[PDB]
Amino acid sequence: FGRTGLPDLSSMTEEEQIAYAMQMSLQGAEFG
Amino acid sequence: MAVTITLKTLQQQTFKIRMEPDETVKVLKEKIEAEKGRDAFPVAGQKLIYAGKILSDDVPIRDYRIDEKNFVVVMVTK
């Protein structure tokens, strides 16, 4: 659907960008 | 006359933005928001994560030592 570099979180934005954000926000800050 | 910030767009897209390290990370929200979406990255809900340190668009990106080698996850909410 949005494989053309466009998420939109299908309307999850807040929870999907907070959930996704955190997961990758820790790019490296917990020895692992 | 600015550096090349580096961020992680929740979607897994690792990229970088062209804002000044001195800016308040808000100008960045303008760019990243324009790149991803004004719905999924509205400067309003635009925030970043550097070492677990969230950064409200009204704070200094430099305050979170956001280097090119490293990135800050761009988290936003509608």
From Swiss-Prot, chain A:
Residues 13-32 form the UIM domain. Residues 18-22 are annotated as: Essential for ubiquitin-binding. Component of the 26S proteasome, a multiprotein complex involved in the ATP-dependent degradation of ubiquitinated proteins. This complex plays a key role in the maintenance of protein homeostasis by removing misfolded or damaged proteins, which could impair cellular functions, and by removing proteins whose functions are no longer required. Therefore, the proteasome participates in numerous cellular processes, including cell cycle progression, apoptosis, or DNA damage repair. Belongs to the proteasome subunit S5A family. The 2 UIM motifs are involved in the binding to a multi-ubiquitin chain in a cooperative way. Component of the 19S proteasome regulatory particle complex. The 26S proteasome consists of a 20S core particle (CP) and two 19S regulatory subunits (RP). The regulatory particle is made of a lid composed of 9 subunits, a base containing 6 ATPases and few additional components including PSMD4. Interacts with NUB1. Interacts with SQSTM1. Interacts with UBQLN4. Interacts with UBE3A. Interacts with UBQLN1 (via ubiquitin-like domain). Interacts with DDI2. This is 26S proteasome non-ATPase regulatory subunit 4. It comes from Homo sapiens (Human). The chain holds residues 270 to 301 of 377 of the full protein.
Curated annotation (Swiss-Prot), chain B:
It comes from Homo sapiens (Human). Belongs to the RAD23 family. It is found in: Nucleus. Changing I49T: Abolishes interaction with PSMD4. The lineage of its organism: Eukaryota, Metazoa, Chordata, Craniata, Vertebrata. This is UV excision repair protein RAD23 homolog A. Multiubiquitin chain receptor involved in modulation of proteasomal degradation. Binds to 'Lys-48'-linked polyubiquitin chains in a length-dependent manner and with a lower affinity to 'Lys-63'-linked polyubiquitin chains. Proposed to be capable to bind simultaneously to the 26S proteasome and to polyubiquitinated substrates and to deliver ubiquitinated proteins to the proteasome. Changing T77S: No effect on interaction with PSMD4. The gene is RAD23A. Changing T9A: Abolishes interaction with PSMD4.
